[PDB]
Design a protein around this ligand. Structure first.
Ligand SMILES: [Zn+2]
Ligand SMILES: [Zn+2]
Lengths: 451, 453
């Protein structure tokens, strides 16, 4: 049943993260904030993802002060973030109290909509954060990270989507970080999900392999409720389809977003000038990258792998590494090649090729996947390698966060003391700084000392 | 609905891609080492000539355009070669005499041209007629062209009419050509549906990515039954150019439209062009993403760029909105001529003048006069009366095909060229008529090149 399609703009988060290393500063945002807020977007994505790490590591911005500045700039349009479930914006699984504290504080500082994902689509890692988002009156969007494999099919996707609907989520996001979701695969998967699961659907696709404009359009024809787009001047390549373009397309159809091309083009003009300033951080790809089309290796993965193959010399072994990825991926139970898992498969595959021996040196990360430390892989991992890193302990088959003790009081302890010992002034809400240290440790301490 | 079948693909990497993306500078020496791989793909055709390449060859690259073609045909024996040809204007600056048109086409074919996408900026079929007819006579493929536009006098029946007019000439296929990137996906669905149902010819789509619509437009056109699309090898695709070849191939793989093209083979060619495109960074434009200004009111990017140059040179630039408000009014008063090169700069320039002077048509340009006089051909709708009558004398407007009034040029050009060539110690080609064509089309620029070849 055809109805108005809702739009979330990613310009203030994933566009810049994807386009120029997450370097967009808050003072480049605020002058165009009132105009963004008057558009009628379903939500504006403007936090989480790599913006926390960028804020504290490169920009000299407090991520929480940024949030409050945006929310004051933009009273009408709900703010969206991307949050990696039990990992939050950090490097490891955290205790439940850390998760709960983070959502509260994010909502207090002005956050509305929460897109909560897990790289393996193990719904258990999403549960606590979704729970707390719902508990904080906020809007919970549970996520499926799209992938392709011998063990992912319509039946598997529907049952994950169902588990999330069962958790009470407010909507479900379908996210294709690599841009590998084809238009006709999108048509089928969305249609199917709209037949089986009683939830609003919201699609996120990258333009990196050139599929994303066609994909969003085929998902809209199959009935997707919402899509993510970027402002025209901040779209394309590594990022996302243009807003105006998909706005123009749906005009005078039943899907008509009702967005104003003229009011949108003004914002695009603003960002065209802003984007020029950041030219030093732009990747080198022009058009789209067909390499990704060949074997579903995401472009960010190929980059990271080639670098490692540079810093060992022997870049001529690239083709062997490429044939190694599928082998290593199967052995680790067909985990999606999605951040930060893709780097685990890539590093290990590079090691398997360089060292001339399959699994001679096994990384801390490959081991942890096998031992169940990240959750349930889509298909059971290889037993011959698992037992070899267990020798002979048991596998973790529970939600890893069941095994980790409460952190917030012991952490709150360390932070207030060290801050005083180091003569560091903490925020008006000290807990926010405690959270920064939880997630980024020394990087967070260096930021707080310099704030 | 049209029957579902394999979509044909034309790759424009050797012509329109780099014309669009780096000032038409791609050299032959960068084309030939990938040529055998391109020929093994199974493209329906490879667009590798015409447009601005002839000019670029002689004006910037020190290449003989005829010789490029021969090298390309040599290197790519199994794939039909394709060119863009502006009807009576050939690749030149004015309407030429029929004997020149006939001579060019015969020479294009004997050098190795197989497919001729023949067009006219106004969609006046009489300007396309001689070239199409000459193409047919040579046993080559004649693709007549509709140049897409949006106007109060343009609609489905009107596009049907033009396509029908071309069908009656016996064209082998009909191209739909969106140079500006303004053809929306659903308008394309509607238009392609109507043409496939009402006119009995193969349809071939060309759309530019400039405004972000082309990927979606090509897909919706395919669903509506279009027979062929133009794409560009991925590393040579996007922004000012065209949808990516591999992206479309992957999208169609295992569907009823399955092109049957090998993605791994295509990617190899793309990895090649990625490096090559690096070398031409100097000539790249500044646009990143899509151009949403095109979407506001259908002003092509090139047209705006050119109007803003004129305004800044004047000055001023703060009269831009007024000039933008002026275009719609001028275009009507000029019979809703498509905003397509070279007719867009006719509208743009006249409009800039009207605003800068402070009086509308205080000054009428040589080109606006020509449009009012019927010297270019028939406008989609009657021009403004009596702006037309202000220009003639008043005489009566020209209502015929312009090439009816031009005297035969080839005998008097062949002699002129041959005598100037010997007196200036300039060695001509094995088939000297090709140089005579080079000079016919480009005058001084041609002479300059022949003198230094
Ligand atoms: Zn993303
Ligand atoms: Zn073109």
């Amino acid at each position: 049943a055809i109805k108005r399609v809702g739009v979330t703009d990613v310009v203030l988060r994933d566009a810049h993260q994807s386009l120029f290393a997450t370097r967009l500063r808050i003072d480049d945002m605020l002058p165009i904030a009132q105009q963004l807020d008057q558009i009628g977007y379903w939500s504006l994505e403007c936090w989480g993802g790599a913006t926390f790490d960028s804020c504290i590591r490169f920009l000299g911005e407090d991520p929480w002060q940024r949030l409050r500045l945006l929310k004051q700039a933009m009273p009408n349009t709900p703010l969206q973030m991307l949050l990696r479930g039990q990992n939050l914006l950090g490097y490891r699984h955290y205790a439940d109290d850390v998760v709960d504290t983070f959502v509260e504080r994010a909502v207090k500082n002005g956050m509305d909509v929460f897109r909560v994902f897990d790289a393996m689509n193990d719904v258990r890692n999403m549960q606590q954060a979704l729970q707390a988002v719902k508990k904080m009156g906020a809007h919970a969007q549970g996520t499926l990270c799209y992938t392709t494999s011998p063990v992912h099919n319509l039946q598997t996707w529907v049952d994950v989507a169902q588990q999330l609907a069962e958790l009470g989520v407010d909507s479900i996001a379908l996210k294709d970080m690599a841009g590998i979701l084809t238009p006709y695969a999108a048509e089928e998967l969305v249609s199917t999900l709209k037949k089986q699961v009683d939830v609003e659907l919201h699609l996120h696709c990258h333009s990196t392999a050139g599929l994303a404009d066609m994909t969003l359009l085929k998902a809209i024809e199959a009935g997707v409720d919402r899509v993510d787009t970027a402002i025209s001047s901040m779209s394309g390549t590594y990022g996302h389809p243009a807003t105006e373009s998909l706005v123009a397309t749906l005009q005078g159809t039943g899907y008509d977003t009702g967005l104003d091309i003229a009011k949108l083009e003004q914002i695009a003009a603003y960002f065209r000038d802003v984007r020029k300033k950041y030219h030093a951080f732009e990747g080198m790809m022009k058009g789209s990258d067909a390499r990704i089309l060949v074997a579903q290796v995401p472009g960010g993965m190929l980059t990271n792998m080639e670098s490692q193959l540079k810093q060992q010399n022997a870049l001529d072994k690239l083709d062997l590494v490429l044939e190694e990825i599928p082998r290593v991926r199967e052995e680790l139970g067909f985990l999606p090649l999605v951040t930060p898992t893709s780097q685990i498969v890539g590093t290990q595959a590079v090691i398997n090729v360089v060292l001339g021996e399959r699994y001679k040196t096994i990384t801390k990360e490959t081991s942890g996947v096998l031992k169940g430390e990240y959750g349930k892989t889509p298909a059971p991992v290889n037993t011959e390698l698992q037992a070899r890193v267990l020798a002979g302990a048991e596998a973790i088959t529970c939600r890893p966060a069941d095994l980790i003790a409460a952190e917030m009081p012991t952490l709150q302890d360390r932070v207030l003391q060290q801050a005083k010992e180091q003569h560091i002034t903490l925020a008006e809400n000290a807990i926010d700084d405690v959270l920064t240290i939880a997630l980024f440790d020394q990087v967070g301490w260096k930021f707080l000392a310099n704030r």
